[PDB]
Design an enzyme around this catalytic site. Sequence first.
Site, short mmCIF file in Angstrom:
data_model
loop_
_atom_site.label_atom_id
_atom_site.label_comp_id
_atom_site.label_asym_id
_atom_site.label_seq_id
_atom_site.Cartn_x
_atom_site.Cartn_y
_atom_site.Cartn_z
NE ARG A 133 -3.82 1.71 2.76
CZ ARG A 133 -4.98 1.60 2.18
NH1 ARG A 133 -5.23 0.55 1.40
NH2 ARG A 133 -5.92 2.55 2.34
CG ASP A 140 -7.38 5.60 11.87
OD1 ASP A 140 -6.85 6.22 12.84
OD2 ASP A 140 -7.09 5.77 10.68
#
Length: 340
Positions: free
Chosen positions: A127, A299
Amino acid sequence: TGPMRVFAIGNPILDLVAEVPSSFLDEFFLKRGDATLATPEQMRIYSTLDQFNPTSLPGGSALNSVRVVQKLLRKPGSAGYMGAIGDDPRGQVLKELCDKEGLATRFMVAPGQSTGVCAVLINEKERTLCTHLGACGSFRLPEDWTTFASGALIFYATAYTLTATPKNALEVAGYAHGIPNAIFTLNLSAPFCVELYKDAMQSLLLHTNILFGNEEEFAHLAKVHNLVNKEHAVEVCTGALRLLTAGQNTSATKLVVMTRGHNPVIAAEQTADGTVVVHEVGVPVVAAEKIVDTNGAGDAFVGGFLYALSQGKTVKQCIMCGNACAQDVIQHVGFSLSFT
Ligand SMILES: Nc1ncnc2c1ncn2[C@@H]1O[C@H](COP(=O)(O)OP(=O)(O)CP(=O)(O)O)[C@@H](O)[C@H]1O
Ligand SMILES: [Cl-]
Ligand code: NA
Protein backbone atom coordinates in the site's frame (compact mmCIF):
# COMPACT_ATOMS: atom_id res chain seq x y z
CA THR A 1 -32.45 11.78 13.10
CA GLY A 2 -29.88 10.01 15.29
CA PRO A 3 -29.54 9.96 18.16
CA MET A 4 -25.96 11.05 17.75
CA ARG A 5 -23.81 9.13 20.20
CA VAL A 6 -20.30 10.20 19.08
CA PHE A 7 -19.13 13.52 17.64
CA ALA A 8 -15.69 13.99 16.14
CA ILE A 9 -13.51 16.58 14.44
CA GLY A 10 -10.85 15.61 11.98
CA ASN A 11 -9.10 16.10 8.66
CA PRO A 12 -11.44 14.55 6.12
CA ILE A 13 -9.76 12.97 3.09
CA LEU A 14 -11.04 11.44 -0.09
CA ASP A 15 -9.02 8.25 -0.85
CA LEU A 16 -8.53 7.32 -4.51
CA VAL A 17 -7.83 3.58 -4.62
CA ALA A 18 -6.25 1.75 -7.58
CA GLU A 19 -4.01 -1.15 -8.41
CA VAL A 20 -1.20 0.46 -10.44
CA PRO A 21 1.87 -0.75 -12.39
CA SER A 22 5.25 -0.23 -10.80
CA SER A 23 6.01 2.25 -13.53
CA PHE A 24 3.45 4.65 -12.08
CA LEU A 25 5.25 4.71 -8.71
CA ASP A 26 8.44 5.36 -10.54
CA GLU A 27 6.91 8.14 -12.61
CA PHE A 28 6.16 10.04 -9.40
CA PHE A 29 9.29 8.94 -7.48
CA LEU A 30 7.27 7.09 -4.87
CA LYS A 31 8.81 4.39 -2.71
CA ARG A 32 6.61 1.32 -2.51
CA GLY A 33 4.99 0.97 0.85
CA ASP A 34 5.72 4.46 2.14
CA ALA A 35 3.09 6.98 3.25
CA THR A 36 4.08 10.53 2.33
CA LEU A 37 2.74 14.02 1.75
CA ALA A 38 2.62 15.08 -1.89
CA THR A 39 5.43 17.17 -3.24
CA PRO A 40 4.63 19.84 -5.86
CA GLU A 41 5.55 17.52 -8.74
CA GLN A 42 3.30 14.83 -7.24
CA MET A 43 0.20 17.00 -7.28
CA ARG A 44 -0.44 15.84 -10.84
CA ILE A 45 -0.92 12.32 -9.53
CA TYR A 46 -4.56 12.77 -8.54
CA SER A 47 -5.73 13.57 -12.01
CA THR A 48 -3.42 11.16 -13.73
CA LEU A 49 -4.91 8.43 -11.51
CA ASP A 50 -8.10 8.56 -13.56
CA GLN A 51 -6.61 6.20 -16.17
CA PHE A 52 -6.89 3.38 -13.64
CA ASN A 53 -10.60 3.94 -12.85
CA PRO A 54 -9.85 4.50 -9.16
CA THR A 55 -12.50 4.08 -6.52
CA SER A 56 -13.26 7.09 -4.33
CA LEU A 57 -13.74 6.41 -0.61
CA PRO A 58 -13.90 8.46 2.59
CA GLY A 59 -10.67 8.54 4.56
CA GLY A 60 -8.79 10.33 7.26
CA SER A 61 -8.19 8.96 10.73
CA ALA A 62 -11.10 10.46 12.70
CA LEU A 63 -13.47 10.06 9.78
CA ASN A 64 -12.65 6.40 9.54
CA SER A 65 -13.18 5.94 13.28
CA VAL A 66 -16.64 7.50 13.20
CA ARG A 67 -17.52 5.46 10.10
CA VAL A 68 -16.96 2.38 12.32
CA VAL A 69 -19.28 3.82 14.98
CA GLN A 70 -21.89 4.61 12.34
CA LYS A 71 -21.65 1.14 10.76
CA LEU A 72 -22.10 -0.54 14.15
CA LEU A 73 -24.90 1.66 15.41
CA ARG A 74 -26.59 1.55 11.94
CA LYS A 75 -29.24 4.21 12.55
CA PRO A 76 -28.78 7.32 10.39
CA GLY A 77 -26.90 10.04 12.22
CA SER A 78 -25.48 7.86 14.99
CA ALA A 79 -22.09 9.55 14.62
CA GLY A 80 -21.34 13.07 13.60
CA TYR A 81 -18.30 14.74 12.14
CA MET A 82 -16.92 18.13 11.17
CA GLY A 83 -13.85 19.15 9.21
CA ALA A 84 -12.91 21.25 6.18
CA ILE A 85 -13.16 20.41 2.50
CA GLY A 86 -12.23 22.48 -0.55
CA ASP A 87 -14.29 23.98 -3.31
CA ASP A 88 -13.61 21.20 -5.79
CA PRO A 89 -15.39 18.06 -7.12
CA ARG A 90 -13.73 15.68 -4.69
CA GLY A 91 -15.25 17.50 -1.74
CA GLN A 92 -18.70 17.02 -3.22
CA VAL A 93 -17.94 13.30 -3.75
CA LEU A 94 -16.75 12.95 -0.19
CA LYS A 95 -19.97 14.47 1.15
CA GLU A 96 -22.07 12.12 -0.94
CA LEU A 97 -20.16 9.07 0.27
CA CYS A 98 -20.58 10.07 3.89
CA ASP A 99 -24.29 10.76 3.39
CA LYS A 100 -24.76 7.25 1.89
CA GLU A 101 -23.25 5.72 4.97
CA GLY A 102 -25.61 7.71 7.18
CA LEU A 103 -23.01 9.77 8.95
CA ALA A 104 -24.06 13.23 10.08
CA THR A 105 -21.50 15.61 8.65
CA ARG A 106 -20.98 19.36 8.28
CA PHE A 107 -17.98 20.09 6.09
CA MET A 108 -16.73 23.65 6.21
CA VAL A 109 -16.02 24.86 2.69
CA ALA A 110 -12.62 26.45 2.22
CA PRO A 111 -12.78 28.54 -0.99
CA GLY A 112 -9.62 28.44 -3.03
CA GLN A 113 -8.39 25.20 -1.46
CA SER A 114 -8.66 21.65 -2.71
CA THR A 115 -10.14 18.83 -0.64
CA GLY A 116 -7.71 16.61 1.18
CA VAL A 117 -6.93 13.64 -1.05
CA CYS A 118 -4.89 10.50 -0.77
CA ALA A 119 -3.67 8.40 -3.71
CA VAL A 120 -3.89 4.83 -2.45
CA LEU A 121 -1.65 2.94 -4.82
CA ILE A 122 -1.87 -0.87 -4.56
CA ASN A 123 1.07 -2.68 -6.04
CA GLU A 124 3.03 -5.85 -5.25
CA LYS A 125 0.96 -6.60 -2.11
CA GLU A 126 1.87 -3.20 -0.68
CA ARG A 127 0.00 0.00 0.00
CA THR A 128 1.71 3.25 -1.10
CA LEU A 129 0.07 6.46 0.03
CA CYS A 130 0.53 10.00 -1.25
CA THR A 131 -1.60 12.61 0.57
CA HIS A 132 -2.27 16.28 -0.04
CA LEU A 133 -3.97 17.71 3.06
CA GLY A 134 -5.27 20.76 1.24
CA ALA A 135 -8.27 22.37 2.85
CA CYS A 136 -7.99 20.31 6.00
CA GLY A 137 -5.67 22.93 7.47
CA SER A 138 -8.30 25.66 7.13
CA PHE A 139 -10.89 24.18 9.45
CA ARG A 140 -12.39 26.45 12.08
CA LEU A 141 -15.14 24.98 14.20
CA PRO A 142 -18.49 26.83 13.77
CA GLU A 143 -19.93 28.20 16.98
CA ASP A 144 -23.19 26.26 16.59
CA TRP A 145 -21.35 22.93 16.55
CA THR A 146 -22.85 22.17 19.96
CA THR A 147 -26.30 22.22 18.41
CA PHE A 148 -25.15 19.88 15.63
CA ALA A 149 -23.80 17.55 18.35
CA SER A 150 -26.77 17.92 20.67
CA GLY A 151 -27.34 14.85 22.84
CA ALA A 152 -23.95 13.27 22.23
CA LEU A 153 -21.90 12.42 25.29
CA ILE A 154 -18.75 11.17 23.53
CA PHE A 155 -16.48 13.65 21.80
CA TYR A 156 -13.35 12.78 19.85
CA ALA A 157 -10.51 14.59 18.22
CA THR A 158 -7.27 13.46 16.65
CA ALA A 159 -4.12 15.35 17.39
CA TYR A 160 -3.92 15.76 13.61
CA THR A 161 -6.52 18.49 14.10
CA LEU A 162 -3.95 20.65 15.88
CA THR A 163 -2.41 21.45 12.48
CA ALA A 164 -5.41 23.64 11.51
CA THR A 165 -5.42 25.15 14.96
CA PRO A 166 -5.44 23.74 18.50
CA LYS A 167 -8.44 25.93 19.14
CA ASN A 168 -10.80 23.46 17.52
CA ALA A 169 -9.96 20.55 19.82
CA LEU A 170 -9.67 22.89 22.81
CA GLU A 171 -13.20 24.15 22.18
CA VAL A 172 -14.57 20.60 21.87
CA ALA A 173 -12.83 19.53 25.07
CA GLY A 174 -13.91 22.64 26.91
CA TYR A 175 -17.52 22.09 26.01
CA ALA A 176 -17.40 18.47 27.07
CA HIS A 177 -15.79 19.47 30.35
CA GLY A 178 -18.83 21.52 31.29
CA ILE A 179 -21.27 18.63 30.78
CA PRO A 180 -21.32 16.07 33.61
CA ASN A 181 -20.90 12.59 32.15
CA ALA A 182 -19.55 13.87 28.85
CA ILE A 183 -16.35 12.16 27.74
CA PHE A 184 -13.61 13.91 25.65
CA THR A 185 -11.28 11.53 23.93
CA LEU A 186 -8.07 12.28 22.11
CA ASN A 187 -5.70 10.39 19.80
CA LEU A 188 -1.96 11.19 19.91
CA SER A 189 -2.10 10.43 16.16
CA ALA A 190 1.59 10.69 15.25
CA PRO A 191 4.97 11.51 16.77
CA PHE A 192 5.08 14.86 14.99
CA CYS A 193 1.88 15.91 16.76
CA VAL A 194 3.37 15.08 20.15
CA GLU A 195 6.62 16.89 19.43
CA LEU A 196 5.18 20.09 17.93
CA TYR A 197 2.23 20.70 20.21
CA LYS A 198 3.58 20.19 23.77
CA ASP A 199 1.86 23.34 25.09
CA ALA A 200 -1.47 22.77 23.42
CA MET A 201 -1.43 19.11 24.48
CA GLN A 202 -0.60 20.05 28.07
CA SER A 203 -3.87 22.01 28.17
CA LEU A 204 -5.92 19.56 26.14
CA LEU A 205 -4.83 16.57 28.18
CA LEU A 206 -6.05 18.16 31.39
CA HIS A 207 -9.47 18.23 29.66
CA THR A 208 -9.18 14.67 28.35
CA ASN A 209 -10.99 11.65 29.71
CA ILE A 210 -9.58 8.97 27.42
CA LEU A 211 -6.23 9.21 25.63
CA PHE A 212 -5.44 6.78 22.82
CA GLY A 213 -2.05 6.21 21.22
CA ASN A 214 0.31 3.55 19.95
CA GLU A 215 3.66 2.52 21.37
CA GLU A 216 5.74 4.99 19.38
CA GLU A 217 3.46 7.91 20.10
CA PHE A 218 3.60 7.21 23.80
CA ALA A 219 7.40 6.93 23.68
CA HIS A 220 7.52 10.46 22.29
CA LEU A 221 4.94 11.70 24.81
CA ALA A 222 7.11 10.28 27.58
CA LYS A 223 10.18 12.06 26.24
CA VAL A 224 8.51 15.43 25.52
CA HIS A 225 6.72 15.51 28.91
CA ASN A 226 9.42 13.68 31.00
CA LEU A 227 7.08 10.85 32.17
CA VAL A 228 9.71 8.05 32.54
CA ASN A 229 8.09 -4.61 27.01
CA LYS A 230 4.98 -4.85 29.12
CA GLU A 231 6.25 -3.46 32.43
CA HIS A 232 7.60 -0.44 30.66
CA ALA A 233 4.30 0.06 28.86
CA VAL A 234 2.54 0.03 32.23
CA GLU A 235 5.00 2.68 33.52
CA VAL A 236 4.47 4.93 30.51
CA CYS A 237 0.65 4.63 30.69
CA THR A 238 0.77 5.35 34.38
CA GLY A 239 3.07 8.37 33.84
CA ALA A 240 0.83 9.65 31.06
CA LEU A 241 -2.13 9.55 33.32
CA ARG A 242 -0.58 12.49 35.34
CA LEU A 243 -1.03 14.65 32.25
CA LEU A 244 -4.79 13.96 32.43
CA THR A 245 -5.14 14.26 36.22
CA ALA A 246 -2.50 16.75 37.32
CA GLY A 247 -1.87 14.19 40.12
CA GLN A 248 -5.20 15.21 41.65
CA ASN A 249 -8.22 13.01 42.30
CA THR A 250 -11.45 13.85 40.48
CA SER A 251 -14.67 11.93 39.84
CA ALA A 252 -14.44 11.70 36.04
CA THR A 253 -13.07 9.07 33.71
CA LYS A 254 -9.30 9.29 33.40
CA LEU A 255 -7.90 6.58 31.19
CA VAL A 256 -4.85 6.05 29.00
CA VAL A 257 -4.97 3.31 26.34
CA MET A 258 -1.85 2.15 24.55
CA THR A 259 -2.21 -0.10 21.50
CA ARG A 260 0.76 -2.39 21.02
CA GLY A 261 0.50 -4.17 17.66
CA HIS A 262 0.01 -7.87 18.13
CA ASN A 263 0.91 -7.55 21.86
CA PRO A 264 -1.65 -6.98 24.60
CA VAL A 265 -3.29 -3.61 24.85
CA ILE A 266 -2.27 -1.87 28.10
CA ALA A 267 -4.35 0.80 29.76
CA ALA A 268 -4.10 2.74 33.01
CA GLU A 269 -7.09 4.29 34.69
CA GLN A 270 -7.24 6.52 37.75
CA THR A 271 -10.13 6.06 40.19
CA ALA A 272 -11.81 8.71 42.35
CA ASP A 273 -9.45 7.93 45.34
CA GLY A 274 -6.29 7.97 43.17
CA THR A 275 -5.86 4.23 42.69
CA VAL A 276 -4.30 3.43 39.38
CA VAL A 277 -6.03 0.39 37.75
CA VAL A 278 -3.94 -1.38 35.13
CA HIS A 279 -5.77 -3.20 32.35
CA GLU A 280 -4.16 -5.75 30.08
CA VAL A 281 -6.13 -7.21 27.18
CA GLY A 282 -4.62 -9.82 24.89
CA VAL A 283 -5.09 -9.39 21.17
CA PRO A 284 -6.69 -12.52 19.62
CA VAL A 285 -4.24 -13.90 17.19
CA VAL A 286 -4.57 -13.13 13.51
CA ALA A 287 -2.44 -15.23 11.23
CA ALA A 288 0.34 -13.44 9.40
CA GLU A 289 -0.78 -14.83 6.11
CA LYS A 290 -4.25 -13.26 6.61
CA ILE A 291 -2.99 -9.75 7.26
CA VAL A 292 -2.83 -7.37 4.32
CA ASP A 293 -1.31 -4.50 6.27
CA THR A 294 -1.96 -2.73 9.52
CA ASN A 295 -2.72 0.69 8.01
CA GLY A 296 -5.71 2.20 9.76
CA ALA A 297 -5.68 -0.49 12.52
CA GLY A 298 -5.56 2.17 15.26
CA ASP A 299 -8.45 4.04 13.60
CA ALA A 300 -10.51 0.87 13.63
CA PHE A 301 -9.55 0.19 17.24
CA VAL A 302 -10.75 3.63 18.31
CA GLY A 303 -13.97 3.25 16.41
CA GLY A 304 -14.78 -0.03 18.06
CA PHE A 305 -13.76 1.28 21.46
CA LEU A 306 -16.02 4.35 21.13
CA TYR A 307 -18.91 2.23 19.88
CA ALA A 308 -18.64 -0.03 22.91
CA LEU A 309 -18.26 2.99 25.18
CA SER A 310 -21.51 4.41 23.78
CA GLN A 311 -23.15 1.10 24.79
CA GLY A 312 -21.92 1.49 28.44
CA LYS A 313 -19.46 -1.41 28.22
CA THR A 314 -16.52 -1.84 30.60
CA VAL A 315 -13.03 -0.72 29.72
CA LYS A 316 -11.96 -4.28 28.93
CA GLN A 317 -15.01 -4.79 26.75
CA CYS A 318 -14.31 -1.54 24.90
CA ILE A 319 -10.73 -2.68 24.26
CA MET A 320 -12.03 -6.04 23.05
CA CYS A 321 -14.39 -4.37 20.60
CA GLY A 322 -11.53 -2.20 19.35
CA ASN A 323 -9.44 -5.27 18.83
CA ALA A 324 -12.22 -7.02 16.95
CA CYS A 325 -12.66 -4.10 14.59
CA ALA A 326 -8.93 -3.80 13.98
CA GLN A 327 -8.76 -7.57 13.34
CA ASP A 328 -11.23 -7.25 10.52
CA VAL A 329 -9.62 -4.14 8.98
CA ILE A 330 -6.09 -5.56 8.85
CA GLN A 331 -7.31 -8.58 6.80
CA HIS A 332 -8.61 -6.26 4.06
CA VAL A 333 -7.13 -3.98 1.48
CA GLY A 334 -8.03 -0.60 2.92
CA PHE A 335 -10.39 0.39 5.64
CA SER A 336 -13.11 -2.21 5.36
CA LEU A 337 -16.42 -1.71 7.19
CA SER A 338 -17.36 -5.40 6.79
CA PHE A 339 -17.17 -6.70 10.36
CA THR A 340 -17.24 -10.37 11.37
N1 LIG B 1 -0.34 -8.14 13.67
C1 LIG B 1 -1.43 -7.90 14.38
N2 LIG B 1 -2.24 -8.86 14.82
C2 LIG B 1 -3.37 -8.63 15.48
N3 LIG B 1 -3.84 -7.45 15.73
C3 LIG B 1 -3.04 -6.44 15.34
C4 LIG B 1 -1.85 -6.61 14.69
N4 LIG B 1 -1.33 -5.41 14.44
C5 LIG B 1 -2.20 -4.50 14.90
N5 LIG B 1 -3.25 -5.11 15.45
C6 LIG B 1 -4.49 -4.57 16.05
O1 LIG B 1 -4.48 -3.16 15.75
C7 LIG B 1 -4.65 -2.42 16.98
C8 LIG B 1 -3.89 -1.08 16.88
O2 LIG B 1 -2.49 -1.35 16.80
P1 LIG B 1 -1.39 -0.20 16.60
O3 LIG B 1 -1.83 1.05 17.21
O4 LIG B 1 -0.08 -0.78 17.00
O5 LIG B 1 -1.47 -0.06 15.01
P2 LIG B 1 -0.81 1.17 14.20
O6 LIG B 1 -1.86 2.21 14.03
O7 LIG B 1 0.46 1.54 14.85
C9 LIG B 1 -0.49 0.22 12.70
P3 LIG B 1 0.67 0.88 11.48
O8 LIG B 1 2.07 0.92 11.97
O9 LIG B 1 0.57 -0.17 10.28
O10 LIG B 1 0.10 2.27 10.98
C10 LIG B 1 -4.02 -3.36 18.03
O11 LIG B 1 -4.50 -3.01 19.32
C11 LIG B 1 -4.52 -4.71 17.55
O12 LIG B 1 -5.87 -4.88 17.99
CL1 LIG C 1 -8.11 13.09 11.42
NA1 NA D 1 -6.91 -2.93 5.76
